[PDB]
């Protein structure tokens, strides 16, 4: 029952689950009645969802993955837990290889979990093994990690993955589990179709929505004192405990370096200490400023794309975007650095049609430079498509969280006075209608 999962969880891996979803996903794999899809975040609970069932399975669990780094790092950890896990890769000595292939062909093999590349899984040099495994009914699950690699609307398309559809079909008896971290509903629809996944596909997608975060859009065209507006915003978000004075830290994002330097200074002078972060600075300078912000010598940082959340923070109570980001995902990713501690936080986008256009041009320029180097890809469509969705995020009226959830493919979220539009629908209508007056400035 549930009983089995608890014991195998503690006895081996030494744990309860990180998410009640992670639990219910794993459980549904284990019952093995249905193919299953998992789109969780970079939180490696995805791994556990297929691994734990595999050990309960009284049969062999194949596990496709696209490159070796990914495999090795996991199979090592699986070994550390005293688990009969095996890799079959083209970076393997002839003798190692032939020893495993032999293992698989045995009545009652050593191997419980086989990590294969799509290359090996395709190669005729493995097919008979495959068939004989099937024939002895010794295959208990087929797993497809980084499933997004099957979709051209994905960020990491690998033709090899396309072959996997046929494979699933061949391995009829066995359920299939697909997993990824980042899947637009287009990707997920590609997955279900490309990997010929049997209905009913059971789905375990972690929603992108987060209660404690408050999204809003402002229009730089409808603001007399921009710098002042930012001060007020930073101030309201910080100093949530006024007897202490200033509590928490926050981020300001720019496209350009001059913007960053200039904006740090303007904020600092208005009484809100901020330091700049851009690739323009020397490496030493950057690593110092990061510490200052991390130790809360400086409550605010003003940064370009080069942040990369190398070391992210719990008490980030505001992320303000001075220019629109390249993608809805890029804004979600960036803004998502806010409120990791679960305490109320503020995410603000400062939209401009002037900005929209300059970035649209820069996207077009850096796409044309790849088309002449390479050619016409369905990914070039996606680059612009990804950006159009975020222009639409700004320019349309509606729950800011539900606009996000549409793009990522989540249920309509429980906002609860959790964004500008949900809080005051009339002031948003005003601000939009206002952008039409000031359309010609």
């Amino acid at each position, epitope marked *: 029952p549930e009983r089995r999962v608890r014991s195998t969880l503690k006895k081996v891996f030494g744990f309860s689950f990180k998410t009640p*979803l992670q639990e219910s996903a794993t459980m549904a794999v284990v019952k093995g009645n249905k193919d299953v899809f998992v789109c969780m975040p970079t939180g490696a609970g995805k791994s556990l969802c297929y691994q734990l069932p595999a050990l309960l399975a009284k049969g062999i669990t194949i596990v496709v993955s696209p490159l070796i780094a990914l495999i090795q790092d996991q199979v090592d950890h699986l070994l550390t837990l005293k688990v009969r896990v095996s890799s079959l890769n083209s970076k393997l000595s002839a003798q190692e290889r032939k020893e495993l292939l032999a293992d698989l062909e045995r009545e009652k093999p050593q191997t419980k979990i086989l990590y294969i590349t799509p290359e090996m899984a395709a190669s005729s040099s493995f097919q008979p093994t495959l068939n004989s495994l099937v024939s002895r009914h010794l295959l208990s699950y087929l797993v497809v990690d980084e499933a997004h690699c099957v979709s051209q609307w994905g960020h990491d398309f690998r033709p090899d993955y396309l072959r996997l559809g046929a494979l699933r079909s061949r391995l009829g008896h066995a359920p299939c589990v697909a997993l990824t971290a980042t899947a637009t509903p287009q990707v997920q629809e590609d997955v279900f179709a490309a990997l010929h996944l049997k209905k*009913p596909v059971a789905i*375990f997608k*972690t929603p992108c929505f987060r209660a404690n975060l408050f999204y809003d859009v402002q229009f730089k065209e409808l603001i007399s004192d921009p710098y002042g507006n930012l001060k007020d915003f930073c101030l309201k978000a910080l100093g949530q405990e006024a007897d202490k004075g200033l509590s928490g830290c926050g981020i300001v994002y720019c496209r350009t370096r001059e913007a960053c330097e200039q904006l740090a200074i303007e904020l600092s002078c208005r009484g809100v200490n901020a330091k700049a972060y851009h690739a323009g600075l020397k490496a030493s300078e950057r690593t110092l400023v990061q510490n200052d912000w991390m130790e809360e010598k400086v409550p605010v940082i003003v940064a370009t794309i080069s942040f990369g959340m190398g070391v992210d923070k719990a008490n980030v109570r505001f992320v303000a975007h001075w220019n629109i980001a390249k993608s809805m995902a890029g804004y979600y990713q960036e803004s998502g650095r806010a409120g990791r501690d679960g305490k109320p936080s503020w995410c603000r986008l400062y939209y401009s049609r002037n900005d929209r256009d300059q970035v649209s041009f820069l996207i077009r320029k850096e796409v044309a430079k790849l088309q002449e180097k390479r050619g016409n890809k369905a990914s070039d469509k996606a680059t612009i498509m990804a950006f159009d969705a975020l222009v639409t995020f700004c320019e349309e009226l509606g729950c800011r969280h539900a606009a996000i959830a549409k793009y990522f*493919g989540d*249920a309509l979220p429980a906002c609860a006075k959790g964004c500008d539009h949900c809080q005051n629908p009339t002031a948003v209508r005003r601000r939009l209608e206002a952008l039409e007056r000031s359309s010609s400035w």
Partner: nanobody
Amino acid sequence: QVQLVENGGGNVQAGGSLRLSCAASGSIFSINRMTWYRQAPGKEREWVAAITSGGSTNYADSVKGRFTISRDSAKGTVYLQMNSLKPEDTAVYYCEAYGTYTLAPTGEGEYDDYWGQGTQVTVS
């Protein structure tokens, strides 16, 4: 689970009209293809008309321009307007919810095809 239920069926005279709706219960996010099928007793199921996610509509050549299907996106309900009926059109009418992506905010959801109960429709 998911429920697909039809209504709007009944008895009419030749050259009459009816409007049919199949109501989709459950945490629906999308339905790849909602399809209208009719079952004359003692004969083969007939494909009638169908609407894709994003409102693209196609109809059988036997019911072209007489029948017309629509989605009240807000309602989450699809309608088959049947005007200029004939005794041929006398059948049971039901829907196929092909590629029915359901999902709650817990992350827990499914993807399956559902078939409706179906409403009796007689044309004198």
